[PDB]
Write a protein that holds these residues in place. Structure first.
Motif, PDB file in Angstrom:
ATOM      1  N   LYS A 133       0.794  -1.243   0.063  1.00 27.77           N
ATOM      2  CA  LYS A 133      -0.254   0.134   0.100  1.00 27.77           C
ATOM      3  C   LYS A 133       0.729   1.251  -0.061  1.00 27.77           C
ATOM      4  N   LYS A 134       0.637   2.051  -1.067  1.00 25.44           N
ATOM      5  CA  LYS A 134       1.248   3.377  -1.336  1.00 25.44           C
ATOM      6  C   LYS A 134       1.192   4.260   0.147  1.00 25.44           C
ATOM      7  N   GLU A 135       1.783   5.581   0.035  1.00 23.73           N
ATOM      8  CA  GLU A 135       1.877   6.429   1.055  1.00 23.73           C
ATOM      9  C   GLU A 135       2.190   7.936   0.516  1.00 23.73           C
ATOM     10  N   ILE A 136       1.390   8.889   1.174  1.00 20.01           N
ATOM     11  CA  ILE A 136       1.731  10.254   0.675  1.00 20.01           C
ATOM     12  C   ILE A 136       2.458  11.261   1.809  1.00 20.01           C
ATOM     13  N   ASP A 137       3.545  11.675   1.463  1.00 21.11           N
ATOM     14  CA  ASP A 137       4.329  12.657   2.341  1.00 21.11           C
ATOM     15  C   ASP A 137       5.042  13.729   1.734  1.00 21.11           C
ATOM     16  N   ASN A 138       4.532  14.933   2.025  1.00 22.96           N
ATOM     17  CA  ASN A 138       5.538  16.324   1.449  1.00 22.96           C
ATOM     18  C   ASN A 138       5.302  16.304  -0.153  1.00 22.96           C
ATOM     19  N   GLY A 139       4.023  15.463  -0.356  1.00 26.24           N
ATOM     20  CA  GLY A 139       3.781  15.705  -2.112  1.00 26.24           C
ATOM     21  C   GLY A 139       4.438  14.544  -2.366  1.00 26.24           C
ATOM     22  N   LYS A 140       5.150  13.532  -1.756  1.00 29.53           N
ATOM     23  CA  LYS A 140       6.085  12.546  -2.539  1.00 29.53           C
ATOM     24  C   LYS A 140       5.144  11.177  -2.536  1.00 29.53           C
ATOM     25  N   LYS A 141       5.483  10.445  -3.513  1.00 29.66           N
ATOM     26  CA  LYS A 141       4.998   9.124  -3.804  1.00 29.66           C
ATOM     27  C   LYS A 141       5.522   8.004  -3.216  1.00 29.66           C
ATOM     28  N   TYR A 142       5.159   7.341  -2.329  1.00 27.90           N
ATOM     29  CA  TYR A 142       5.536   6.203  -1.577  1.00 27.90           C
ATOM     30  C   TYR A 142       4.899   4.880  -1.560  1.00 27.90           C
ATOM     31  N   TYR A 143       5.531   3.828  -1.240  1.00 30.66           N
ATOM     32  CA  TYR A 143       5.098   2.365  -0.951  1.00 30.66           C
ATOM     33  C   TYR A 143       5.652   1.622   0.349  1.00 30.66           C
ATOM     34  N   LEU A 144       4.949   1.541   1.328  1.00 28.47           N
ATOM     35  CA  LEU A 144       5.598   0.964   2.670  1.00 28.47           C
ATOM     36  C   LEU A 144       6.136  -0.354   2.121  1.00 28.47           C
ATOM     37  N   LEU A 145       6.985  -0.782   3.044  1.00 30.45           N
ATOM     38  CA  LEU A 145       7.980  -2.104   2.591  1.00 30.45           C
ATOM     39  C   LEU A 145       7.746  -2.987   4.263  1.00 30.45           C
ATOM     40  N   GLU A 146       6.827  -4.019   3.993  1.00 26.49           N
ATOM     41  CA  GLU A 146       6.652  -4.936   5.386  1.00 26.49           C
ATOM     42  C   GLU A 146       7.962  -5.794   5.538  1.00 26.49           C
ATOM     43  N   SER A 147       8.453  -5.430   6.814  1.00 22.07           N
ATOM     44  CA  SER A 147       9.563  -6.361   7.487  1.00 22.07           C
ATOM     45  C   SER A 147       9.271  -6.498   8.784  1.00 22.07           C
ATOM     46  N   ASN A 148       9.520  -7.639   9.490  1.00 21.86           N
ATOM     47  CA  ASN A 148       9.213  -7.878  10.828  1.00 21.86           C
ATOM     48  C   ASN A 148       9.756  -7.008  11.954  1.00 21.86           C
ATOM     49  N   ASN A 149      10.555  -5.899  11.549  1.00 17.38           N
ATOM     50  CA  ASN A 149      11.162  -5.108  12.190  1.00 17.38           C
ATOM     51  C   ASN A 149      10.431  -4.631  13.313  1.00 17.38           C
ATOM     52  N   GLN A 150      10.882  -4.900  14.605  1.00 18.83           N
ATOM     53  CA  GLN A 150      10.287  -4.486  15.828  1.00 18.83           C
ATOM     54  C   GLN A 150      10.480  -2.856  15.950  1.00 18.83           C
ATOM     55  N   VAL A 151      11.497  -2.448  15.749  1.00 23.58           N
ATOM     56  CA  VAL A 151      11.678  -0.852  16.005  1.00 23.58           C
ATOM     57  C   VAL A 151      11.707  -0.024  14.896  1.00 23.58           C
ATOM     58  N   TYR A 152      12.176  -0.302  13.764  1.00 22.26           N
ATOM     59  CA  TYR A 152      12.014   0.443  12.479  1.00 22.26           C
ATOM     60  C   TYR A 152      10.811   0.051  11.383  1.00 22.26           C
ATOM     61  N   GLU A 153      10.670   1.336  10.470  1.00 17.87           N
ATOM     62  CA  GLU A 153       9.732   1.305   9.421  1.00 17.87           C
ATOM     63  C   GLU A 153      10.390   1.815   8.347  1.00 17.87           C
ATOM     64  N   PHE A 154      10.137   0.963   7.315  1.00 22.88           N
ATOM     65  CA  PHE A 154      10.922   1.488   5.851  1.00 22.88           C
ATOM     66  C   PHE A 154       9.846   1.743   4.930  1.00 22.88           C
ATOM     67  N   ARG A 155      10.235   2.167   3.592  1.00 24.36           N
ATOM     68  CA  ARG A 155       9.530   2.563   2.663  1.00 24.36           C
ATOM     69  C   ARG A 155      10.323   2.751   1.300  1.00 24.36           C
ATOM     70  N   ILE A 156       9.858   2.732   0.168  1.00 26.95           N
ATOM     71  CA  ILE A 156      10.577   3.007  -1.060  1.00 26.95           C
ATOM     72  C   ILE A 156       9.936   4.105  -1.620  1.00 26.95           C
ATOM     73  N   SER A 157      10.588   4.463  -2.962  1.00 26.26           N
ATOM     74  CA  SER A 157      10.110   5.601  -3.555  1.00 26.26           C
ATOM     75  C   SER A 157       9.786   5.238  -5.058  1.00 26.26           C
ATOM     76  N   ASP A 158       9.339   6.086  -6.050  1.00 28.66           N
ATOM     77  CA  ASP A 158       9.053   5.600  -7.171  1.00 28.66           C
ATOM     78  C   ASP A 158      10.125   5.676  -8.387  1.00 28.66           C
ATOM     79  N   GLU A 159      10.253   6.990  -8.701  1.00 22.17           N
ATOM     80  CA  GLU A 159      11.471   7.271  -9.875  1.00 22.17           C
ATOM     81  C   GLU A 159      12.705   6.763  -9.288  1.00 22.17           C
ATOM     82  N   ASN A 160      13.120   7.302  -8.310  1.00 24.63           N
ATOM     83  CA  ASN A 160      14.363   6.647  -7.759  1.00 24.63           C
ATOM     84  C   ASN A 160      14.183   5.667  -6.577  1.00 24.63           C
ATOM     85  N   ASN A 161      14.736   4.516  -6.701  1.00 20.94           N
ATOM     86  CA  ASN A 161      14.580   3.381  -5.941  1.00 20.94           C
ATOM     87  C   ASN A 161      14.924   3.655  -4.232  1.00 20.94           C
ATOM     88  N   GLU A 162      15.230   4.944  -4.174  1.00 20.59           N
ATOM     89  CA  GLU A 162      15.735   5.028  -2.657  1.00 20.59           C
ATOM     90  C   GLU A 162      14.994   4.549  -1.772  1.00 20.59           C
TER      91      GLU A 162
END
Ligand code: NI
Length: 498
Positions: A133-162
């Motif tokens: 499921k995508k996400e919106i922040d500061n006019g930025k296009k995102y996609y969260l990435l599910e990982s069993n991380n207890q403490v961190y949350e991640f996400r990727i970007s569209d144009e740049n794979n950052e």
């Protein structure tokens, strides 16, 4: 030795090496008649390495990751490595990564992690992460990435794979921190003006060449003149000088981490073989020195499950078949049955050992005792006999290592076991003499009694392994049945009473 080891394809899968690389190594081992041992590679780094990503060398000591989106790469922030939450560990890593950048004036840097197309797929093939499921922040296009991380949350970007990251709602990192979204940066190498990401490298555990094969290559005249002479059985210093002369064994006083000339050519051969298979990231092997991956002189794959098993495998198939290998770390030559082996606890590290130490371990153990008790091995102040005292400890350290290594340069396999046992006996003797001066502090006295017991135990199990009725015979041969029953019983009684 073959204690439940793995072999064939199962050994290859557990080792992490890319299949085509291991196969090219198989030829080297076979062409050169050498054993090749590797530490296991991070299994999530295999695809990266086969796809050309460059490996870390001497200048980067940061741990690669086994989890999350960064899995396989070396995170600048070590709290994203196989070190989930070890305060001490993560702090040492982060420092090392900072220093890697400062000390190499541009050859090492960090760049934003970019999980391309195929990678995300590969991570999905395994139990690492899934897209979503995508996400919106500061006019930025995102996609969260599910990982069993207890403490961190991640996400990727569209144009740049950052790939980015932040701390959980009320979770704290193991350093006592928290933050909002920051890009994930990984360690890199300056190739030609461009920083390229780094991954795990293939760690050589050892290279064990054939001693008999080596002898065959040396001029016969010189060999017979340096070996066949006065040293009666043991004490082959000649063999050692030839191996050093012909660049097989490293120089006399091993510099910080020098490699023998034969070892350097072997590295070139391995790296060259991997390039020939399409690898475009440079070198896969960068230096030469608890599971172990083994490639024998016949191209077979073996994998030992723990250190004791690999120590026994080396003794039986490598060192016991005349291949060259030096033990710096100890192991028990004969395994534990019902009665467990006694243990000694290091005063400082609080680690427990149940083996006969090698020379370097002996030196360290004595160092822990010196720290913890604040006194040296002997007590007489205004050192007198300060020469023999020092020599005494040196002789023990030498015999402890001989117990494991004197057989390395001995050709006769039946003589190998015999010299090893005798060396253990020399160590025992030297230790007992130190205790017979009665000038030993008490914390060292306990440690010396531990050495005496383990030595006694192992030497008894080794003799019996050869001749199962040797205990009976050592006593029986000393008896005389030509005498009358009573006299013969007194003899028997003296022998077992003394
Ligand atoms: Ni390495």
């Amino acid at each position: 030795d073959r204690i439940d080891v793995l072999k064939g394809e199962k050994a290859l899968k557990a080792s992490g090496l890319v299949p085509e690389h291991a196969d090219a190594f198989k030829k080297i081992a076979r062409e050169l008649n050498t054993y090749i041992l590797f530490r296991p590679v991070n299994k999530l780094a295999t695809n990266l390495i086969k796809s050309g990503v460059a490996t870390k060398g001497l200048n980067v000591h940061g741990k690669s990751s086994d989890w999350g989106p960064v899995a396989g790469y070396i995170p600048f922030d070590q709290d994203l490595s196989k070190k989930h939450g070890q305060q001490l560990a993560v702090e040492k890593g982060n420092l090392e990564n900072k220093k890697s950048i400062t000390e190499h004036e541009g050859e090492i840097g960090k760049i934003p992690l970019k999980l391309d197309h195929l990678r995300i797929e590969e991570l999905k093939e395994n139990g690492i992460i899934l897209k979503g499921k995508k996400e919106i922040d500061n006019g930025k296009k995102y996609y969260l990435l599910e990982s069993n991380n207890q403490v961190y949350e991640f996400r990727i970007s569209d144009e740049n794979n950052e790939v980015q990251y932040k701390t959980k709602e009320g979770k704290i990192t193991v350093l006592g921190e928290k933050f909002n979204w920051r890009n994930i940066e990984v360690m890199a190498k300056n190739v030609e003006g461009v920083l390229k990401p780094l991954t795990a490298d293939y760690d050589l555990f050892a290279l064990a060449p054939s001693l008999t094969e080596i002898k065959k290559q040396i001029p016969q005249k010189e060999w017979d003149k340096v070996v066949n002479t006065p040293n009666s059985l043991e004490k082959q210093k000649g063999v050692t000088n030839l191996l050093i002369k012909y660049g097989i064994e490293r120089k006399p006083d091993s510099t910080k981490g020098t490699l023998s000339n034969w070892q350097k050519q072997m590295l070139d051969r391995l790296n060259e073989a991997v390039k020939y298979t399409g690898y475009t990231g440079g070198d896969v092997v960068n230096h030469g020195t608890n599971e172990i991956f083994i490639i024998n002189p016949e191209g077979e794959f073996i994998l030992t499950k723990n250190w004791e098993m690999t120590g026994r495998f080396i003794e039986k198939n490598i060192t016991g078949k005349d291949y060259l290998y030096y033990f710096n770390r100890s192991y028990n030559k004969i395994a534990p049955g019902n009665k467990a082996y006694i243990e000694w606890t290091d005063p400082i590290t609080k680690a427990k050992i149940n083996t006969i130490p090698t020379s370097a371990e002996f030196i360290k153990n004595l160092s822990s005792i010196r720290r913890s008790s604040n006194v040296g091995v002997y007590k007489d102040s205004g050192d007198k006999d300060e020469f023999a005292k020092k020599e005494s400890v040196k002789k023990i350290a030498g015999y402890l290592s001989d117990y494991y290594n004197s057989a390395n340069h001995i050709f006769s396999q039946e003589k190998k076991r015999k010299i090893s046992i005798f060396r253990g006996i020399q160590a025992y003797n030297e230790i007992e003499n130190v205790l017979k001066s009665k000038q030993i502090a008490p914390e060292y006295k306990n440690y010396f009694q531990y050495l005496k017991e383990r030595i006694t135990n192992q030497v008894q199990l080794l003799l019996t392994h050869q001749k199962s009725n040797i205990e009976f015979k050592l006593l029986y041969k000393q008896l005389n049945f030509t005498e009358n029953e009573t006299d013969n019983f007194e003899v028997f009684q003296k022998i077992i009473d003394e």
